[PDB]
Enzyme design. Structure first.
Site, PDB file in Angstrom:
ATOM      1  N   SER A 240       0.846  -1.186   0.000  1.00  0.00           N
ATOM      2  CA  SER A 240       0.000   0.000   0.000  1.00  0.00           C
ATOM      3  C   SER A 240       0.877   1.229   0.000  1.00  0.00           C
ATOM      4  O   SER A 240       2.068   1.140   0.297  1.00  0.00           O
ATOM      5  CB  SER A 240      -0.875   0.004   1.266  1.00  0.00           C
ATOM      6  OG  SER A 240      -1.285   1.320   1.607  1.00  0.00           O
TER       7      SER A 240
ATOM      8  N   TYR B 114      -1.791  -1.179  10.644  1.00  0.00           N
ATOM      9  CA  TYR B 114      -1.756  -1.414   9.206  1.00  0.00           C
ATOM     10  C   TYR B 114      -0.463  -0.859   8.615  1.00  0.00           C
ATOM     11  O   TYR B 114       0.201  -1.517   7.820  1.00  0.00           O
ATOM     12  CB  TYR B 114      -2.951  -0.737   8.535  1.00  0.00           C
ATOM     13  CG  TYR B 114      -3.061  -1.018   7.052  1.00  0.00           C
ATOM     14  CD1 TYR B 114      -3.691  -2.169   6.583  1.00  0.00           C
ATOM     15  CD2 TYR B 114      -2.537  -0.124   6.117  1.00  0.00           C
ATOM     16  CE1 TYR B 114      -3.803  -2.424   5.211  1.00  0.00           C
ATOM     17  CE2 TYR B 114      -2.642  -0.365   4.747  1.00  0.00           C
ATOM     18  CZ  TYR B 114      -3.276  -1.514   4.303  1.00  0.00           C
ATOM     19  OH  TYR B 114      -3.398  -1.749   2.956  1.00  0.00           O
TER      20      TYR B 114
HETATM   21  N1  LIG Z   1      -8.676  -0.956  -1.807  1.00  0.00           N
HETATM   22  C1  LIG Z   1      -7.690  -0.066  -1.654  1.00  0.00           C
HETATM   23  O1  LIG Z   1      -7.907   1.136  -1.904  1.00  0.00           O
HETATM   24  C2  LIG Z   1      -6.329  -0.432  -1.197  1.00  0.00           C
HETATM   25  C3  LIG Z   1      -5.210   0.570  -1.006  1.00  0.00           C
HETATM   26  C4  LIG Z   1      -3.937  -0.053  -0.542  1.00  0.00           C
HETATM   27  C5  LIG Z   1      -3.749  -1.338  -0.301  1.00  0.00           C
HETATM   28  N2  LIG Z   1      -4.779  -2.309  -0.460  1.00  0.00           N
HETATM   29  C6  LIG Z   1      -4.467  -3.719  -0.166  1.00  0.00           C
HETATM   30  O2  LIG Z   1      -4.909  -4.530  -1.225  1.00  0.00           O
HETATM   31  C7  LIG Z   1      -5.450  -5.785  -0.735  1.00  0.00           C
HETATM   32  C8  LIG Z   1      -6.845  -5.855  -1.313  1.00  0.00           C
HETATM   33  O3  LIG Z   1      -7.676  -4.865  -0.680  1.00  0.00           O
HETATM   34  P1  LIG Z   1      -9.182  -4.755  -1.180  1.00  0.00           P
HETATM   35  O4  LIG Z   1      -9.596  -3.362  -1.386  1.00  0.00           O
HETATM   36  O5  LIG Z   1      -9.603  -5.679  -2.273  1.00  0.00           O
HETATM   37  O6  LIG Z   1      -9.944  -5.238   0.192  1.00  0.00           O
HETATM   38  P2  LIG Z   1     -10.992  -6.348   0.432  1.00  0.00           P
HETATM   39  O7  LIG Z   1     -11.350  -6.368   1.873  1.00  0.00           O
HETATM   40  O8  LIG Z   1     -12.129  -6.222  -0.522  1.00  0.00           O
HETATM   41  O9  LIG Z   1     -10.136  -7.657   0.021  1.00  0.00           O
HETATM   42  C9  LIG Z   1      -9.389  -8.361   1.031  1.00  0.00           C
HETATM   43  C10 LIG Z   1      -9.795  -9.810   0.981  1.00  0.00           C
HETATM   44  O10 LIG Z   1      -9.034 -10.455   2.023  1.00  0.00           O
HETATM   45  C11 LIG Z   1      -9.834 -11.475   2.528  1.00  0.00           C
HETATM   46  N3  LIG Z   1      -9.286 -11.870   3.811  1.00  0.00           N
HETATM   47  C12 LIG Z   1      -9.159 -11.111   4.944  1.00  0.00           C
HETATM   48  N4  LIG Z   1      -8.623 -11.773   5.966  1.00  0.00           N
HETATM   49  C13 LIG Z   1      -8.392 -13.037   5.453  1.00  0.00           C
HETATM   50  C14 LIG Z   1      -7.844 -14.197   6.038  1.00  0.00           C
HETATM   51  N5  LIG Z   1      -7.413 -14.321   7.281  1.00  0.00           N
HETATM   52  N6  LIG Z   1      -7.743 -15.316   5.251  1.00  0.00           N
HETATM   53  C15 LIG Z   1      -8.183 -15.223   3.954  1.00  0.00           C
HETATM   54  N7  LIG Z   1      -8.709 -14.205   3.309  1.00  0.00           N
HETATM   55  C16 LIG Z   1      -8.789 -13.118   4.125  1.00  0.00           C
HETATM   56  C17 LIG Z   1     -11.209 -10.838   2.607  1.00  0.00           C
HETATM   57  O11 LIG Z   1     -12.291 -11.785   2.725  1.00  0.00           O
HETATM   58  C18 LIG Z   1     -11.277 -10.048   1.303  1.00  0.00           C
HETATM   59  O12 LIG Z   1     -11.912 -10.702   0.189  1.00  0.00           O
HETATM   60  C19 LIG Z   1      -5.314  -5.727   0.786  1.00  0.00           C
HETATM   61  O13 LIG Z   1      -4.148  -6.461   1.202  1.00  0.00           O
HETATM   62  C20 LIG Z   1      -5.163  -4.230   1.075  1.00  0.00           C
HETATM   63  O14 LIG Z   1      -4.367  -4.029   2.269  1.00  0.00           O
HETATM   64  C21 LIG Z   1      -6.056  -1.877  -0.895  1.00  0.00           C
END
Ligand SMILES: NC(=O)c1ccc[n+]([C@@H]2O[C@H](COP(=O)([O-])OP(=O)(O)OC[C@H]3O[C@@H](n4cnc5c(N)ncnc54)[C@H](O)[C@@H]3O)[C@@H](O)[C@H]2O)c1
Ligand SMILES: NC(=O)c1ccc[n+]([C@@H]2O[C@H](COP(=O)([O-])OP(=O)(O)OC[C@H]3O[C@@H](n4cnc5c(N)ncnc54)[C@H](O)[C@@H]3O)[C@@H](O)[C@H]2O)c1
Ligand SMILES: NC(=O)c1ccc[n+]([C@@H]2O[C@H](COP(=O)([O-])OP(=O)(O)OC[C@H]3O[C@@H](n4cnc5c(N)ncnc54)[C@H](O)[C@@H]3O)[C@@H](O)[C@H]2O)c1
Ligand SMILES: NC(=O)c1ccc[n+]([C@@H]2O[C@H](COP(=O)([O-])OP(=O)(O)OC[C@H]3O[C@@H](n4cnc5c(N)ncnc54)[C@H](O)[C@@H]3O)[C@@H](O)[C@H]2O)c1
Lengths: 261, 261, 261, 261
Positions: free
Chosen positions: B145, B158
């Site tokens: 991120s 985080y």
């Molecule tokens: N969406 C954003 O704007 C953004 C910005 C920076 C970083 N990220 C990173 O990108 C990744 C995706 O984020 P996103 O927006 O799709 O979020 P999201 O919550 O939609 O996707 C995360 C997924 O992780 C799964 N998950 C959580 N804990 C788990 C566990 N213990 N075992 C298995 N699965 C598990 C959830 O069910 C979910 O489908 C994350 O690692 C997040 O930190 C996202």
């Protein structure tokens, strides 16, 4: 490979040899219109032009010294006049010579700063000026080095010019992001270009350089041209202001392998 | 788009929704064999599977909680058993909840560290262990991120987990570079995923987030999936140990626009 | 040396040996009240206490394991109860053991993360919680390492814990800057502490470590304690959120000396 | 405060006003011999001299334009001739003017690069040349800015000059570490100097700058002079090649407070 590059007009400074040449060829293969640049005489430029014809590409060669303001202005205008527009500006020209820092003359320092940094500034300025006045969401790619991060004894002027290029690029990226103009740096590690054919020809020096590369091999120019083509494409639409290092792991402190120390 | 991805086996944790889902779909489109992962709700995973069938892709869904060692080990083995091999491991699962740092319970801190950091470590360990024992030049992509660089009040756990992911990735990249195994991080800025549909639904919050993005718009999941596909391909053969930020310029200090200050 | 330190109450975790011990002695010399911390039995603690009495300082020793929440809470309370207040919190306890990353057990990984990162989080949380509830402009100093920046094969858990400590510190510094609370990291290079007496005892290993230090010598604990004392003083009133590296130049890529490569 | 500074000879460029002046005064208070530098207006330099006499310090003022090689060479020689030696060289002179990047003339760009970067290079070169030829373990301190890290729209030349200063300093630090010569940068945030008396005089601008400072207040020159004195002393004996930011938290992305976004 990148459909959106077809028809884009790409200008590349110092592209009659080395990385510049490889990028010119790669962009021609992507069916983009290319403007090659040479400094002294149209001759090395012709080798590149024939390579581009060989792939069915369209291109022209324009003389210009990046340390001469009018030459840079003319270079950008030549692209617009010949192809009607400008989409990608790549500042690649550069040079360097080793000298102990406390013995470096002001003359040597200025030559490197003028070419590596100021030259890139002039090129970026002219391209962006055009993009802004004609509402074009163009892109600028500045050729940096792992040395915008890794210090370099004997080459203090080169390291300074690249450290400066880093902040220049990040500033331009922030300043013009609202207008859709992207500005990024590419940071090559040790690459196999003609300018390095001799140092790498000697087995003792070659092995020395390779020991500083975690992946174990000196990169090929094509591996850098691949980075430039991707950054220029719409696949990298949300990417701006970064430095993409392509160095086989050089910036990860090679001397610390095997948990040494 | 990337011919070398055809036939490659790609495992993606937390891929039943958001970025994970988009990447699963993109890789299927590149004709790679995909292994989707869901923690609890199976119905969600099947939805992704239908999207992949729709594009002619081949894939399976495996249940697994990245905070359970045996689940991660089983996930990697399931890929090898079903498709005969493993080429790309993508650690994407993650979570976060806001809390003032001095009021954060050990419980909340551990949950985020375990999922965001340790989960990625376990996934990287198993994939690399396989690559090494079978002499495969595989690759690991860890989803980071902009916050592995930008501090984040209210989300100290985080930010710490991603700062840790950065050094973990760089260490693994250096440690295994000699064997041709590449390890890189992708650093997304503000992306339009379901998990953010509500905050971005409110016009006052949306406009607030957009004011922190130089390019002026919240990115789409596809813009991140494009980065993952490129990093996994042979076009990025000389790239390892980096963090590729795709953030619309967020890491360039948005509050300094217009030479303010 | 620093008049403002007289009467300040300083808590230092893991201070019965090494850097922690040197800092305890240095702060006593600055006439600050010190709280020493030991893990198993009051014994190594007594050596430090006698050293402090020898300089006319005032101090007490409190047992506590930084991986046990109640022990950390009690440690902070013991300071307030014994001296009536708390001014400086120094999270210094830590540990590490070498293991190939793909062979590292979850157990070893957790032990290092819990001690190096979570331990520091707990200590920072309790100190800041106190500073906020009593409107005190206190300061927190977290002991990091050059490895929050330099990758470390065989010590992936340690590198991750420090990379995480970096983002934790920067986040806390931003989150509490409005209240005058400063949070900084100290990043020691190779230091001559008991824990390293054997590795450095062997002339072939010693010479190996020294070759990674531009200044050419392994630092002394006092050189680090000097940094901690300055950061704690009012002389560093406008400094917060940084990592002050004291490494003889180690983070400047030692393998690039003599313009090599 | 620092006993080892007594008798040391300190040269400070652009020290007739602002930060340079405060540092000159602070070093005089530490009983070091100071060499003040003025570009044109001599009356200003004499004012600083009176401040130094007021504290019982010893000093002289030397005219010199840091963009003129012979002036810099003469400045260093004047110190050696008047006090018999040189111990600390501080490159502080600098300037900047706002202009949209695509509208910046080559003239404005060069003026800032020449003064901020090349001027510092010349000063560092002459000091180090002296240190090397006479086997002196001297030190060089280069005045940078938070902008060697934070991009700065409207000031692309200034940001570039400081980004370049960063790599210059790190290179020199690595190159001369074997000889005991230390080279560091100081990175001031928003400081209350005369040059900023007007912008900060206006309550709407002042409040605007303060909103970008986590600690909530514009720093005083003395808070920077304290950093310079410490870095020059033997207390910082194992510190070299770093940039010590004294910015009230500015480099920690102020727009992300309150977990916003
Ligand atoms: N969406 C954003 O704007 C953004 C910005 C920076 C970083 N990220 C990173 O990108 C990744 C995706 O984020 P996103 O927006 O799709 O979020 P999201 O919550 O939609 O996707 C995360 C997924 O992780 C799964 N998950 C959580 N804990 C788990 C566990 N213990 N075992 C298995 N699965 C598990 C959830 O069910 C979910 O489908 C994350 O690692 C997040 O930190 C996202
Ligand atoms: N080759 C590498 O390993 C490597 C590593 C890091 C960075 N780089 C950077 O990549 C770029 C390409 O390097 P390269 O290996 O192809 O070197 P090169 O010397 O072969 O290419 C540089 C080109 O710049 C041209 N040039 C120099 N000064 C000029 C001027 N004033 N006006 C116009 N043209 C001018 C030269 O004629 C030459 O063709 C350079 O900017 C270099 O700093 C190269
Ligand atoms: N010595 C170096 O060269 C060096 C270089 C970089 C960083 N550091 C860091 O500096 C700190 C001091 O290192 P050091 O050389 O003095 O090592 P050390 O082992 O001598 O000191 C660490 C102390 O932590 C204590 N400790 C460990 N686990 C604990 C726990 N759970 N609860 C309470 N106390 C615990 C140990 O008993 C020990 O006294 C560490 O955090 C280390 O990571 C040291
Ligand atoms: N004031 C701040 O908030 C701030 C923030 C970051 C960095 N800095 C840096 O700190 C330094 C001091 O800044 P300041 O606020 O005191 O500014 P200032 O303008 O008051 O001081 C700069 C001095 O440099 C002198 N100077 C300029 N060009 C010169 C030349 N060619 N030869 C000799 N002297 C020359 C000027 O006469 C002036 O006295 C500068 O290098 C600046 O970039 C200042």
């Amino acid at each position: 490979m990148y459909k959106d590059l077809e028809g884009k007009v790409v200008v590349i400074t110092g592209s009659s040899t080395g990385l510049g040449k490889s990028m010119a060829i790669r962009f021609a293969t992507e069916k983009a219109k290319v403007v090659v640049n040479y400094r002294s005489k149209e001759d090395e430029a012709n080798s590149v032009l024939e390579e581009i014809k060989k792939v069915g590409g369209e291109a022209i060669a324009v003389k210009g010294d990046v340390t001469v303001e009018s030459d840079v202005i003319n270079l950008v205008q030549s692209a617009i006049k010949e192809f009607g527009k400008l989409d990608v500006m790549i500042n690649n020209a550069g040079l360097a010579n080793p000298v102990s820092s406390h013995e470096m003359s002001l003359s040597d320092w200025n030559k490197v700063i003028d070419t590596n940094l100021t030259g890139a500034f002039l090129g970026s300025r002219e391209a962006i000026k055009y993009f802004v006045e004609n509402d074009i969401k163009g892109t600028v790619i500045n050729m940096s080095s792992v040395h915008e991060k890794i210090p370099w004894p004997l080459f203090v002027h080169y390291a300074a010019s690249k450290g400066g290029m880093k902040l220049m690029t990040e500033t331009l990226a922030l300043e013009y992001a609202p207008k859709g103009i992207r500005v990024n740096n590419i940071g090559p590690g040790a690459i196999n270009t003609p300018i390095n054919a001799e140092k790498f020809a000697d087995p003792e020096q070659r092995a020395d350089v390779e020991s500083m590369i975690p992946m174990g091999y000196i990169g090929e120019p094509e591996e850098i041209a691949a980075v430039a083509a991707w950054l220029a494409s719409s696949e990298a639409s949300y990417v701006t202001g970064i430095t993409l290092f392509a160095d086989g792991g050089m910036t990860q402190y090679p001397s610390f392998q095997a948990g040494r120390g």
